[PDB]
C-alpha cells in the first residue's frame, strides 16, 4: 500500500516520461487500451504503486503531466501508450516559457501552479498512503525547470513527510542544446538542494556513447536515449512492486545512499547493456553483471568515477540470483581497489534482490552512486554560470519578469558550496 506519484514537466519531461510509462506498462503487462494482459499473477500483486483501479478493470496511471507549451500534449496523446493518462491530469499553458526559468517560476507559472496543486491534491487523498513523489524534468530548459521546481517547492510545504526523486537531466559537457542552459541549471540546483530529498542526474552525452560504443547501434534516435532513461527508473522501484529476497524500498534508497542532507545528488547506470550482435557470445552470469555495473563507461552522468570516490553505492538486482556470488563480488571490488572507495564508511555498497527480472532479460542490476566525482558536473556548470553572469549576459530577459541578481549571486553561492563540500569529503 505504497503509492508513487509521477510528475513530468516541460518538453523533455512529457516526452521521456512517456517512455517511462511505456516500459512500466510493458513490464506490469497492461495493454495500450488499459486492461491487464500479463502472464503471471505477480504483476497484479502491487498495481496500486503506479495505477488506479477504475471502471471496467482499466488502470489509469498516477501521473500528472504539466507544461507551458501545448505542443507536447499533441505529441503525448498521439504516441503509443498515450491514451492511458487521465485528461484531468493534462494541465497545460498557452504562452510557453521558452527556456526561461523566470517565466516558468514567477510570471506565467503563477496562474498555473495554483491549478496543478488542485490536480495533485485530487490524486493525493484519493490513495491511501503517499510514499512520496517522483519528478523527471529538465534543467537546461525553462518550462520544466522554473514551472517544475516551483511545484517541487510547493509540494514539500504541503506534504513535508514525503520523499522526492528528481530525475533531472543536466546540460551535456561537450555539446549544448540551449544557449541559456547554465542559467537555468544553476537556478534549478539552488531550489533542488533544500527541497528535493534526493536527486539522480542523467546526461545525454553519457547516454550517447553508451548507445553507440556499448549498444553497437549506428544511429540511435531520442527514443533509444529515453529507453535507458526509462529502464533505470523502473530499476529504482523494482523492489517495491515485486517481492524479493531482500527488499529496498525507495526510502531505503534515500536513507542509505545519503550521508548528509545536502549531499544527495547521485549518478545512475544500467548493468546488462549488450548489443544484438554481441549478446549470444556473452555468458549471462553475475560476474559479467558486476564488471559492467562498476565500469566507468556504463554510468549515465557526465562524471568519470576514476576522478572521485563513491561515498555510498547501491545495486538493485532483479531476478533469481545466488546471493553468495552477489555478496562476494561487491566484497571483491571493495577489496580489489580500496582507493576508489571512500575509506571512512566500511562496506559502502548496498545490494537488494528482486526475485522477478524485467521482460526478456533474466538477470539485471541498477547502480545508484553518490559519488564525489559528480562535482565535476557541478563545477563545469558553475564556471559557465560565473562567466555568463560577470558580463550580465542574457539578463534583461530574466530580470524583466520579476528577478534581481541577488538570487543569481545566491544560486552561485550554493553551486560552489556543493563542489567545495563534495571535494572536502573526498579527502
Amino acid at each position: 500500500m505504497r503509492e508513487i506519484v509521477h510528475i513530468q514537466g516541460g518538453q523533455c519531461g512529457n516526452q521521456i516520461g512517456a517512455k517511462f510509462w511505456e516500459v512500466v506498462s510493458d513490464e506490469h503487462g497492461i495493454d495500450p487500451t488499459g486492461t491487464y494482459h500479463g502472464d503471471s499473477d505477480l504483476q497484479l500483486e502491487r498495481i496500486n504503486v503506479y495505477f488506479n483501479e477504475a471502471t471496467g478493470g482499466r488502470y489509469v496511471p498516477r501521473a500528472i503531466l504539466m507544461d507551458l507549451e501545448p505542443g507536447t500534449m499533441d505529441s503525448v496523446r498521439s504516441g503509443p501508450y498515450g491514451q492511458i493518462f487521465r485528461p484531468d491530469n493534462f494541465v497545460f499553458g498557452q504562452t510557453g516559457a521558452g527556456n526561461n526559468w523566470a517565466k516558468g517560476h514567477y510570471t506565467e507559472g503563477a496562474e498555473l501552479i495554483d491549478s496543478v496543486l488542485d490536480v495533485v491534491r485530487k490524486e493525493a487523498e484519493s490513495c491511501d498512503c503517499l510514499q512520496g513523489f517522483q519528478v523527471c524534468h529538465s534543467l537546461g530548459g525553462g518550462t520544466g525547470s522554473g514551472m517544475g521546481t516551483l511545484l517541487i517547492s510547493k509540494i514539500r510545504e504541503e506534504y513535508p513527510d514525503r520523499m522526492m526523486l528528481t530525475f533531472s537531466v543536466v546540460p551535456s559537457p561537450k555539446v549544448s542544446d540551449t544557449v541559456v542552459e547554465p542559467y537555468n541549471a544553476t537556478l534549478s540546483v539552488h531550489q533542488l538542494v533544500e527541497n528535493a530529498d534526493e536527486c539522480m542526474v542523467l546526461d545525454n552525452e553519457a547516454l550517447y556513447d553508451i548507445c553507440f560504443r556499448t549498444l553497437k547501434l549506428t544511429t540511435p534516435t531520442f527514443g533509444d536515449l529515453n529507453h535507458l532513461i526509462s529502464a533505470v527508473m523502473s530499476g529504482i522501484t523494482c523492489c517495491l512492486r515485486f517481492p524479493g529476497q531482500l527488499n529496498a524500498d525507495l526510502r531505503k534508497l534515500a536513507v542509505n545512499l545519503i550521508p548528509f542532507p545536502r549531499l544527495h545528488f547521485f549518478m545512475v547506470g544500467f548493468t546488462p547493456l549488450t548489443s544484438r550482435g554481441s549478446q549470444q557470445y556473452r555468458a549471462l552470469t553475475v560476474p559479467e553483471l558486476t564488471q559492467q555495473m562498476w565500469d566507468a563507461k556504463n554510468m549515465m552522468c557526465a562524471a568519470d568515477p576514476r576522478h572521485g570516490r563513491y561515498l555510498t553505492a547501491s545495486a538493485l538486482f532483479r531476478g533469481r540470483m545466488s546471493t553468495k556470488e552477489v555478496d562476494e563480488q561487491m566484497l571483491n571490488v571493495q577489496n580489489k581497489n580500496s582507493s576508489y572507495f571512500v575509506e571512512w564508511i566500511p562496506n559502502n555498497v548496498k545490494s537488494s534482490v528482486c526475485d522477478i527480472p524485467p521482460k526478456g532479460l533474466k538477470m539485471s542490476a541498477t547502480f545508484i552512486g553518490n559519488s564525489t566525482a559528480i562535482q565535476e558536473m557541478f563545477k563545469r556548470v558553475s564556471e559557465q554560470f560565473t562567466a555568463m553572469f560577470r558580463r550580465k549576459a542574457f539578463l534583461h530577459w530574466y530580470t524583466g519578469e520579476g528577478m534581481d541578481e541577488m538570487e543569481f549571486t545566491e544560486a552561485e553561492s550554493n553551486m560552489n558550496d556543493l563542489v567545495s563540500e563534495y571535494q572536502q569529503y573526498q579527502d
Binding site: 501545448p70 510557453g96 549544448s176
Partner: protein, 430 residues
C-alpha cells in the same frame, strides 16, 4: 491554440509575402483556391467549411504591387480587406511614410490587426517584413511597429528586414531611410534577422548555379528560411522551438538583437543526385561564409549566439557531433563568454520543393540564424555612407517638407553611434 500573424510592409515585403505564402499553401497542401483537398491553424484561420485565409495584412502605399496580388494566382486566397493599399507611395521618403500619408492609413491598419487578434485564441507573435531602404518599408512600418507595441504589450516581433548591401544598392537615399528606420526598430523590434540583397545573388550564382536569377527566384530561398524557423511551431519535432523561445535565446542584451542567416543545402536538381547530402556536409556548409544570407565574413567578427534549425531525417547524435566539430575548428571563432552557443531545433518534416523553383528536393536542411559581431561591418559602412550624404545636406529638403524636422536626422544618427560602440565592446575580450 497558437497562431502567428505575419506583417509585410513595402513592395519588397509583398513580393516576399507572395513568395513566403506560396510555400505555406504548398507545404500544407492548400490550393490557390483556398480549400483543403490543424497544421494550417498556425497560419490559416478556418472560415466556414474547408476554407483557409492567411493571418496576414499586406499594407503598402503603392497600389500597383498590392493589386497585383489581387489579380494574381491567389485572388480567392487572401482576404481583400486585409490587403491595404495607398493612393500615393512614400517613394523613398521616411517623412511621407511616418507623418503625412501614414497617419490616415494606420488607423485602418490597426483595425484589421485588432480584428485579427480576437480571431486567434493565443497569439504567439508577429513576423514583420520590410525593406529599410524603401519609403513605406521604413516609414509605414515604423509608425506601425510603435502602434503594435503600445497596443499589445511585450508580444514578440521578428524583424525580417532587407538591408541594402554596402557594395550594391538600387537607390540613392537608402542610407537615409535605413538610418531613420533603425531608430525605430531598436526600441520596438525584439529580434531583427538581417537579410542582404546582394549576398543571396552570390548564392544563386555559385551554389544554386543559376546564372540569370530574378527577384522571384531570390525571394524563394529567403522564403525557405522563413518556413524553416517557424516549422517547429508548425510541426512536431524532437526538440521543438517556438517564436517566443527565440528572443530570449538569441538576444543577450536589449539593444543587440541582429541576426545573420544561413541556409545550408543550396544545390540544383542535377546537382542533387551527385551530392552526398549529409548532416556533416550541411553543417559544415552552414558556417561557410558564402552560404550566409547577409554579406558577411564571420572571420572578421565573432559568433556570440547561434541557433540551428534542423529539418528532416536527422538523428540526434550527428547534429551533436557537428556541434563538437565546429568548436574544434579554429576557422569558426566564438566569443569567450558564451560557451553554450548552440540551440538545436529539429523538425521531422523534410522541406517542400516549389514547382518550377530552382531549389531541389532534399531530405535534410539546416537554417542557421546566428547573432554575430561581424554585423557592425554593415552598420559601419552604412554610417560611413550616411556621413558622406549628410556632410552637405543633400536629399534633406524632401524630408523636412513632409512633417519631419531637421533634429530627427541627428537623433537617429546618434543611436547608430551607440549601436556601433556596443557591438565592439561586447565582442571585446575581458
Amino acid at each position: 491554440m497558437r497562431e502567428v500573424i505575419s506583417i509585410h510592409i513595402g513592395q519588397a515585403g509583398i513580393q516576399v509575402g507572395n513568395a513566403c505564402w506560396e510555400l505555406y499553401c504548398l507545404e500544407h497542401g492548400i490550393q490557390p483556391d483556398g480549400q483543403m483537398p490543424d497544421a494550417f491553424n498556425t497560419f490559416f484561420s478556418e472560415t466556414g467549411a474547408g476554407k483557409h485565409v492567411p493571418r496576414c495584412i499586406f499594407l503598402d502605399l503603392e497600389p500597383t504591387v498590392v493589386d497585383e496580388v489581387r489579380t494574381g494566382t491567389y485572388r480567392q486566397l487572401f482576404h481583400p480587406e486585409q490587403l491595404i493599399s495607398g493612393k500615393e507611395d512614400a517613394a523613398n521618403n521616411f517623412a511621407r511614410g511616418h507623418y503625412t500619408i501614414g497617419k490616415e492609413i494606420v488607423d485602418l491598419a490597426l483595425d484589421r490587426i485588432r480584428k485579427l487578434a480576437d480571431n486567434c485564441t493565443g497569439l504567439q507573435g508577429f513576423l514583420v517584413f520590410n525593406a529599410v531602404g524603401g519609403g513605406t518599408g521604413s516609414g509605414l512600418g515604423s509608425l506601425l511597429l510603435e502602434r503594435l507595441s503600445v497596443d499589445y504589450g511585450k508580444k514578440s516581433k521578428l524583424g525580417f528586414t532587407v538591408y541594402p548591401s554596402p557594395q550594391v544598392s538600387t537607390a540613392v537615399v537608402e542610407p537615409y531611410n535605413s538610418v531613420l528606420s533603425t531608430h525605430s526598430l531598436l526600441e520596438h523590434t525584439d529580434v531583427a534577422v538581417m537579410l542582404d540583397n546582394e549576398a543571396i545573388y552570390d548564392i544563386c550564382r555559385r551554389s544554386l548555379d543559376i546564372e540569370r536569377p530574378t527577384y522571384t527566384n531570390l525571394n524563394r530561398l529567403i522564403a525557405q528560411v522563413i518556413s524553416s524557423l517557424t516549422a517547429s511551431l508548425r510541426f512536431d519535432g524532437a526538440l521543438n522551438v517556438d517564436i517566443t523561445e527565440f528572443q530570449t535565446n538569441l538576444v543577450p542584451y536589449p539593444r543587440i538583437h541582429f541576426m545573420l542567416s544561413s541556409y545550408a543545402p543550396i544545390i540544383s536538381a542535377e546537382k542533387a543526385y551527385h551530392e552526398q547530402l549529409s548532416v556533416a556536409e550541411i553543417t559544415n556548409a552552414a558556417f561557410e561564409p558564402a552560404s550566409m544570407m547577409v554579406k558577411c565574413d564571420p572571420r572578421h567578427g565573432k559568433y556570440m549566439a547561434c541557433c540551428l534549425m534542423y529539418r528532416g531525417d536527422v538523428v540526434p547524435k550527428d547534429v551533436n557531433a557537428s556541434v563538437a566539430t565546429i568548436k574544434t575548428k579554429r576557422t569558426i571563432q566564438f566569443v569567450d563568454w558564451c560557451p553554450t552557443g548552440f540551440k538545436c531545433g529539429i523538425n521531422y518534416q523534410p522541406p517542400t520543393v516549389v514547382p518550377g523553383g530552382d531549389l531541389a528536393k532534399v531530405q535534410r536542411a539546416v537554417c542557421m540564424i546566428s547573432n554575430s559581431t561581424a554585423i557592425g561591418e554593415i552598420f559601419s559602412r552604412l554610417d560611413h555612407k550616411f556621413d558622406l550624404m549628410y556632410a552637405k545636406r543633400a536629399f534633406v529638403h524632401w524630408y523636412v517638407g513632409e512633417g519631419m524636422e531637421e533634429g530627427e536626422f541627428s537623433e537617429a544618427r546618434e543611436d547608430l553611434a551607440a549601436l556601433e560602440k556596443d557591438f565592439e565592446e561586447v565582442g571585446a575580450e575581458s
